[PDB]
Structure formats: C-alpha cells, structure tokens
C-alpha cells in the first residue's frame, strides 16, 4: 500500500487550508489537497484542525499525583511557599519507593498523551534524601514510554547546591545515569550565592556536555539580576542556545526598563524561557517577549502534588488558562498562545527541525474536534485522535497503544 | 413512595455520604440508607452531588454571534466597551426574532449540560433592538422552564442619557414582564451619575422590580459610582434589592476606599457579581467574602462581540477564578465553590428554596468527582442533571 496512514480533511493553521496528509512509517510524506492512492489505515479529521504534538516544556513527573487519595487534596490546608514545599518533598522522598515514583511518572505521561502532548521535559529531584532513586525510576519509566511520548530529563538540584552539600556529587551521578540536562534553583534567595551556584552549574554541564534548565522564580530586580548573570555566563562559557530559564516571574514586577535593557542580552545569549500556566503572573509581558523575538514556551509545572494542587496535563486547557491570566481576546493573541504550546516549545526543547506538519517531518500529530487554534482554546473540545511515530496511540479518549 | 432516589451521594455541607429521596419537585429524605427500591434511581457512586450552579450574569440574547467561521468573528480588533456597543447596534439592526430565540435556547442547553439550573440574563434595550430582543428572550424563557430558571434584566445598554428613547423602551420591557432593571456606567457612559441612578430607581419603583447595574468603570470613579448607588439604595427603601455587576474598580482603587465603603454595602444589603471572563487578578474576592459581602459569579457574555470565550460551565469558571486570583488552599477553593452555588442563589433571591436539604427544591447535579475541590481541579464532566425532581441530563445528553 502506498501509505501506511492518511489523515483526511485536515485543516492546517500554518497554511490556512484543508489537506490530506499521507504518512509512511514515522514520517510525513505527502500533504496535498486530495491524496490518490491505496492506504492501510485512515482517519477523517472532517475539516477540523490537525496540529503537531503539544509541547509541555516543564513538568515534575517524579512527584506528581502525590496529593491524590482522599476526599480533599492532601497538603493544601496551608498556603504555598517554596521552602515549605521543599520540606514536604524531603519528607515524601524519605519513604517513597522506586515503583510508586515509576507509577506516578507513567500516570502523568498517559494523562499528557490523552491530551495530545507528545513531548515533555521533566525535572527530577536530586538531593540527599531522594539521592538518585527518583532519577532511576524516571529513566526506567521513560524507556517504557518511548512509543507514547518523548521525554527530556533534567537533573534538578531542588534543595540548592550550597544548602545541601551532597548535591554536586549526586547530580554528577545522575548525569552519568543519562539525564539530558542539568539545573538548579534560585541562585539568590535559595543558594545565597549567585556567582558560585551558577558557575558550578556550568561546570557540571560542560563535564557531561548537557544543556541547562534553571528554576529562577525570585521576583523583582533580584530575579532579573540573576537571569542577567546567567545569560552573561552563558556567553562566557560558549553555551549560546543551550540554556533555558524556567518561570522568570520577575519579568512581571521588575521595572519594565530592566527588561527592555536585558532583551538584547537574552537574544545575544540565545536565552530560552518557559512560563508555566499554573503560575504565569497576570502582568507577565508574554506578548511583548514574543514580539521582541524571544523564545518562550509553556508548561504544566507540577501536577497534583505539594507545590501545585491543580493539573490535567492538558496544554489546550493551559492555553485557555493563559488567555485568562493575561486577559487576551484577539485572534492574533490567541494564535501566539497556540504557538507557545507548539512550535515555541519545540524550539525550547531543541527539536524544531523535525517539528511541524510539513513534508519530511515526524508523523507526531493531534486531530482535534475544533475548527482552529482559536476555537480549540475557546471550546476546549476533547481530542479526536493522537498519532505518535505514524501510529495511532489515542482514539476516542482511550490509549490504544 | 419516592419518584426518584439518588444513591451514594457525597454532600459537602454534611461531609458524608447519603441517599436522597425525592417526590415531585422536592427533597423529602436524606438518610444514610433509604429502604426500598423505586423505578427511577441514580447512583452517584460516592461522588459529590451539588445543588444546581448559579450563573448570575449572562447575555443570552446576543450569545454565539461570534460563531460561524474558521476564526471567531469580531476579534481582529481589541475590546473596548464603546466599540462593542456599536457592534451590538449594527448586529441588532437586521437580527430576527427567531435567530435571537435560537441563540437563547442554545445558550440555555449549553448551561444545563454543565449543571447550571439558574441564570440571570440581561437583554439589550435601546433604539435599534427596541423590545425585539426582550420579546424573543421572554418567549424562549417560557419554552425553557422545565430546564432552567431565568431572570431577565431590562438593560439599557446604550445609556439612558445617551440614547434618549431608552426610558420608554425600558418601561415597555418591564410591562412585557422583565424581572429586573439596570443600566451601565453612570460616570463614563452616561456622563451623569445622580440622574442615571435616580431614573433607574424611579423605573424600578414604578414596576416594583429589583435592580442589577453594570458598573465596570475602574478606579475611584467606579467606587464612587457604587457608593452613590448604595446610598440611594437606602434612601429609596431598596435594601437587599440591588446588585452591582462587575465592580472591577475594587481591584485598582486604593484599598482604603473599599475598607470605608464595606459598612455602607452591608447597611444597604448591596449584592455583587464578578464574571470569570473578567474578574481582575487583584480583585479582593476572598476579602469581600470574609467581610460577609454577598458575591456571586457568572459567565458574562458567551461567544459574541464583547467576549469570544465561553462554555457556560461554572465549574470551568471556578478553575478560571483560582488561576486569575492565584488560589490553591482547600479553604479558598471552597469559597469559590460557594460563589458558583449558594452565593449566586442569594444574589438571585432564591436562598430559601436552595440547597441539598429536606424541604428544598430537587434541582441537583451529580458530579464525577469526589469534592468541590477535586471537581474544580479535575474538571470531570457532569454525570447527571436533575431539575424539578426530573432527570434532564444524562451522559452529556439532554434527555428532557
Ligand atoms: Cl554572588
Ligand atoms: Cl453627577
Ligand atoms: Zn518547576
Ligand atoms: Zn454584562
């Protein structure tokens, strides 16, 4: 048969028209208004949007769903602070077993693929209590999940390199076990040492030739200062394009001139950013960042744990959440958010060359029940079909892999 | 014996699981186990059963006018009140009775699918819509009465002192049977705060109806406008009969302005509605509720030239509010749940017949989640909706 799979009547946003999509193995082979030829399996999109797989650029699969199990969410009789949530992890990771972490990771993944997410980058706690236990469970589950979702794994020193002094050796080990990236947390208010926390991160990154994804959630000028130091060291170390800053809440409350002055530094350093829809500050200058050409992806962050009680692993729900946080309504703006959950996330992850609905690219696709990006955000219809490596893995809200 | 029993229903106010027995349109028995079987039963399977959600502010008449193309119509340009007013005037020129009616019913069906059984809609009354939109809404309201209770506000969307035909058209609308009267922005729309408000109260007293005013003006001008409204509420003997919609101004006005006004609002019995399509992120929602202010919640417009969004789903709206307002604790999520239920009931005036208690209306929603908190978080679809003791929704289908 000429194609292994054809998608019929697929509206493609980037072309603003309806096409048949022909697939062989794990690749898109043909995109034509009508495809002639024999074919093994077919899906009719019926004039609706077909999209590349959504990118969830920042998750914590390892400690997800730990809030579940009772009538009320566990942990949430008290308000969120970073330091208190760090203490809850340490206590949780004391008795947590390999298999239950694994189970949580797989559950998290299944929930994501059900919503059309086919690429994620997760961080995993590495500290003196979790040790490499959580890393091992994640890497193992990642192996089992490879026909459903691509996972990048950040060795994440959640307690601080200069607070928990066992962090440096545990991370080295985690990187040797095969984690893809390295990152720490809040150089200023967590580490109390900006130059040293950052220099150490770059040293470890260069030793194992891995990219970097840093949690910088500190607000105000202290946050912008921290990100500036990071971007400057990015250049000094020859790591242009290899560094991501997660959160960057500080862009919301720091004076706007601080960001205006830093933008050229961010472009020069190839600095990439991820805003999580469970925390994007309402005054975050998201539109402004994108119009200035900054690479800004989007993400669930934590899901149903002791940091964040929320989460459905659904980036289309997350897109709606961002329109509301940021008070957007125009079709153009809703389109920029759609880019955030797709092609911007691809760039953050480094996979842009194989990403998109174009001849030659990976047959990783989502058939939606809505007419357009805008309409999908608005109506929140469930996914009709999910396709990974040219194979149907989701149909009718069931994982059929 | 019972016309209907709901089995294994978790009830939040009691924090326990119960069977619920219903006869006609009333709840008759709430017991841990109800002895005997009946023809019509629903098993909630340990999940939350809730009173019907209240969507305290909608515009059913002009809903879904954005639909019909690949991209939402109207939204190639940004929102301003005045521009959206002009779009309505143009839309209402050629709009027919039946098309408005169709939109109203569609809106209602969408709402009941999500467990909303009570709504208050505003309907445009001005020199182009005239009473055409009122007539279509009232008619559809009559057809929908087995699905959802509707209150209808005669709403002078263009301004009493801007469109001078408004006063007579509203009087007519009220005589046709609209339940409430309201205007818009006494300051930046009417350019006359004392007169726009005094006229609204005159019309209200002529027809003995309650009031629901759109005050979206920001800052001190908004708070000042609401203060004048609350003060006239007292002067006119209308304590408890006045609702202020939006009140965005509580978000940006200095906090001391609100602190000083709160006793006035309590004295006047002022009621408020925040719409989840616009609640400002710094709106002091929690603070209002802890001070004992009655604050309901609402979709506002749905897929029109004011708001492109909307699914008429208050549980989705509750999630939206947690994100706008940055709430996470179980207590705070519980206050939002109150906003979409019992607070809305109070705004609408129906609290005596509202709740899952013996004696109250058998208007209920069987959810697929364990608790208010878990429902907000997981957004599971509704299992069953019951209105006047009859099943009207099952497995996402309207079965009435
Ligand atoms: Cl330093
Ligand atoms: Cl005045
Ligand atoms: Zn994180
Ligand atoms: Zn309104």
Question: In sequence order, what DSSP letters do the residues of A81-107 get, joined into one string?
Answer: -HHHHHHHHHHHHHH--HHHHHHHHHH
The Å distance, Cα B282 to ligand 3 centre, comes to: 24
Q: Do A80 and B310 touch (CB under 8 A)?
A: no
Alpha carbon distance B68, B75 (integer Å): 13
In the numeric block, which tokens belong to residue B274? 């925040």
Alpha carbon distance A383, A369 (integer Å): 6
Q: What residue has token string 């009465």?
A: B145
Is B59 flagged in the annotation as binding?
yes
In the numeric block, which tokens belong to residue A340? 């955030």
Is B107 flagged in the annotation as binding?
no
Burial call A66-93: b when 16+ CB within 10 Å, e when fewer: bbbeeebbbbbeeebebeebbebbbebb
Fold that domain A1-53+355-401 belongs to in CATH: Urease, subunit C; domain 1 (2.30.40)
Length of chain B: 400
Alpha carbon distance B200, B180 (integer Å): 10
Can A1-53+355-401 and A54-354 be said to share one CATH topology? no
Name the nearest CA neighbour of A173 among A128, A142, A218. A128
Alpha carbon distance A285, A281 (integer Å): 9
Secondary structure E strands in A140-210 = 150-156, 181-183
Using the Cα atoms of residue B2, residue B6, residue B12 and residue B17 in order, give the sign of their dihedral. Answer: positive
Helical H segments across A208-246, by residue range: 220-236
The Å distance, Cα B373 to ligand 3 centre, comes to: 23
Alpha carbon distance A198, A226 (integer Å): 9
Q: Do A78 and B329 touch (CB under 8 A)?
A: yes
**Chain A interface residues facing chain B, Cβ-Cβ under 8 Å?**
11, 16, 71-73, 76-80, 277-278, 282, 304, 308-312, 317, 320-321, 323-325, 329-332, 334, 371-372, 374-375, 378-380
CB within 5 A of ion ligand 2: which residues? B 193-194
Q: Indicate the Cα dihedral angle A227, A232, A236, A241, nearest 10°.
A: 60
Test the A interface: residue of B323, B325, B336, B379 with most A CBs within 10 Å: B323
Count the neighbouring beta carbons within 10 Å of the beta carbon of residue B1. Answer: 12
Q: What residue has token string 């105000």?
A: A220
The Å distance, Cα A374 to ligand 4 centre, comes to: 22
Residues of B whose CB is below 8 A from A372: 70-71
The Å distance, Cα B189 to ligand 2 centre, comes to: 12
- What H or E segment, with its residue span, contains residue B246? strand B242-246
Is A98 flagged in the annotation as binding?
no
- What H or E segment, with its residue span, contains residue A378? helix A373-379
Q: Do B378 and A312 touch (CB under 8 A)?
A: yes
Helices then strands (H, E): number in chain B? Answer: 13, 17
Do A78 and A87 touch, CB atoms closer than 8 A?
no
Spatial CB neighbours of A80, under 8 Å, sequence gap ≥ 6: A307, A308, B328
Alpha carbon distance A200, A184 (integer Å): 10
Sheet of strand B49-51, all strands in order from the earlier edge strand to the far edge: B49-51, B364-367, B382-387, B390-394, B397-398
Using the Cα atoms of residue A53, residue A57, residue A63 and residue A66 in order, give the sign of their dihedral. Answer: negative
Catalytically annotated residues of B: 246
CA of B198 vs chain A CAs: smallest distance (Å): 34
- What H or E segment, with its residue span, contains residue B295? strand B294-298
Q: Quick one: residue A19, left, alpha or beta (phi over 0 = left, psi -120 to 50 = alpha)?
A: beta
Alpha carbon distance B303, A294 (integer Å): 31
Alpha carbon distance A343, B238 (integer Å): 56
* Among A11, A79, A324, beta carbon nearest to B324: A324
Spatial CB neighbours of B115, under 8 Å, sequence gap ≥ 6: B50, B52, B53, B314, B315, B365, B367, B382, B385, B393
Do A195 and A236 touch, CB atoms closer than 8 A?
no
* Among A11, A71, A330, beta carbon nearest to B78: A330
Do A273 and A230 touch, CB atoms closer than 8 A?
no
Q: Indicate the Cα dihedral angle B115, B320, B58, B151, nearest 10°.
A: 50
- What H or E segment, with its residue span, contains residue B86? helix B81-94
Do A250 and A222 touch, CB atoms closer than 8 A?
yes
Q: Do A72 and B307 touch (CB under 8 A)?
A: no
In the numeric block, which tokens belong to residue B332? 């705070």
Q: What residue has token string 């034509």?
A: A32
Alpha carbon distance B13, A286 (integer Å): 41
Test the A interface: residue of B17, B45, B67, B71 with most A CBs within 10 Å: B71
**Chain B interface residues facing chain A, Cβ-Cβ under 8 Å?**
10, 15, 70-72, 75-79, 276-277, 281, 303, 307-311, 316, 319-320, 322-324, 328-331, 333, 370-371, 373-374, 377-379
Is A58 flagged in the annotation as binding?
yes
* Among B308, B370, B379, beta carbon nearest to A312: B379
- What H or E segment, with its residue span, contains residue B338? helix B330-340
Name the nearest CA neighbour of A364 among A390, A338, A335. A390
Name the nearest CA neighbour of A1 among A29, A31, A41. A41
In the numeric block, which tokens belong to residue B91? 């839309």
- What is the DSSP code (8-state) at residue B380? P
Name the nearest CA neighbour of A276 among A53, A57, A77. A57
CA of B44 vs chain A CAs: smallest distance (Å): 15
**Minimum Cα–Cα distance from B326: chain A residue:** A279
Alpha carbon distance B334, B376 (integer Å): 9
Do A344 and A98 touch, CB atoms closer than 8 A?
no
Alpha carbon distance A210, A181 (integer Å): 5
Give, to the nearest 10 degrees, the angle between helix B193-206 and helix B219-235: 40
- Residues B53-353: name the CATH superfamily: Metal-dependent hydrolases (3.20.20.140)
In the numeric block, which tokens belong to residue B79? 């929102």
Length of chain A: 401
CATH number for the domain running over A54-354: 3.20.20.140
Alpha carbon distance A249, A216 (integer Å): 8
* Interface contacts (A, B; CB < 8 Å): 92
- What is the DSSP code (8-state) at residue B280? -
Residues of A whose CB is below 8 A from B308: 329, 334, 374, 378
Helical H segments across A3-146, by residue range: 82-95, 98-114, 133-144
Ligand nearest to the CA of A197: 1
The Å distance, Cα B65 to ligand 4 centre, comes to: 15
Give, to the nearest 10 degrees, the angle between helix A256-268 and helix A220-236: 20
Radius of gyration of chain A (CA): 21
CA of A322 vs chain B CAs: smallest distance (Å): 9
First to last CA, chain B: 23
Count the neighbouring beta carbons within 10 Å of the beta carbon of residue A156. Answer: 30
- What is the DSSP code (8-state) at residue A380? -
CATH number for the domain running over B1-52+354-400: 2.30.40.10
CA of B183 vs chain A CAs: smallest distance (Å): 25
Give me the residue spans of the domains in chain B: 1-52+354-400, 53-353
Q: Indicate the Cα dihedral angle A264, A266, A267, A270, nearest 10°.
A: 160
Q: Do A76 and B328 touch (CB under 8 A)?
A: yes
Alpha carbon distance B298, B288 (integer Å): 16
Ligand nearest to the CA of A185: 3
Do A183 and A212 touch, CB atoms closer than 8 A?
yes
Name the nearest CA neighbour of B276 among B298, B254, B293, B261. B298
Secondary structure E strands in A228-292 = 243-247, 272-276
């Amino acid at each position: 048969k000429d194609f292994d799979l054809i998608i019929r009547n697929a509206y493609l946003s980037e072309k603003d028209s309806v096409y048949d999509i022909g697939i062989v193995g794990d690749r898109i082979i043909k995109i034509e208004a009508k495809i002639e030829g024999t074919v093994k399996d077919e899906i009719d999109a019926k004039g609706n949007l077909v999209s590349p797989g959504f990118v969830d650029a920042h998750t914590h699969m390892d400690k997800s769903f730990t809030s579940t199990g009772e009538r009320l969410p566990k942990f949430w009789s008290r308000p969120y602070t970073r330091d208190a949530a760090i203490e809850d992890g340490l206590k949780y990771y004391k008795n947590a077993t390999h298999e239950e972490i694994k189970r949580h990771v797989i559950e998290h993944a299944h929930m994501q693929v059900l919503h059309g997410t086919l690429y994620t980058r997760t961080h995993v706690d590495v500290d003196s209590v979790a040790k490499t236990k959580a890393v091992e469970a994640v890497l193992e589950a990642k192996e089992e999940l490879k026909d459903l979702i691509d996972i990048q794994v950040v060795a994440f020193a959640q307690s601080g390199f200069f607070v928990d002094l066992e962090s440096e050796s545990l991370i080295r080990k985690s990187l040797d076990m095969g984690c893809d990236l390295v990152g720490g947390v809040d150089p200023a208010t967590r580490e109390n040492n900006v130059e040293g926390s950052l220099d150490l991160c770059f040293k470890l990154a260069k030793e194992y030739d891995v990219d970097i994804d840093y949690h910088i959630a500190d607000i105000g000028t202290v946050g912008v200062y921290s990100i500036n130091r990071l971007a400057q060291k990015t250049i000094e170390n020859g790591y242009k394009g290899r560094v991501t800053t997660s959160h960057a809440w500080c862009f919301a409350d720091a004076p706007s001139e601080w960001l205006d002055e830093a933008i050229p530094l961010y472009k020069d350093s190839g600095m990439k950013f991820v805003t999580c829809f469970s925390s994007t500050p309402p005054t975050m200058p998201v539109i402004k960042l994108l119009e200035a050409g900054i690479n800004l992806g989007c993400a669930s962050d934590n899901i149903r744990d002791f940091w964040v009680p929320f989460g459905n692993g659904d980036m289309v729900q997350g897109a709606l959440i961002e329109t509301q946080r940021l008070e957007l309504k125009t079709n153009r703006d809703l389109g920029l958010i759609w880019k955030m959950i797709t092609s911007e996330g691809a760039r953050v992850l480094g996979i842009e060359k194989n990403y998109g609905i174009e001849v030659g690219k990976k047959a990783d696709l989502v058939v939606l029940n809505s007419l357009s990006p805008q309409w999908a955000i608005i109506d929140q219809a469930k996914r009709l079909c999910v396709i990974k490596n040219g194979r149907i893995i989701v149909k009718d809200e069931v994982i059929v892999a």
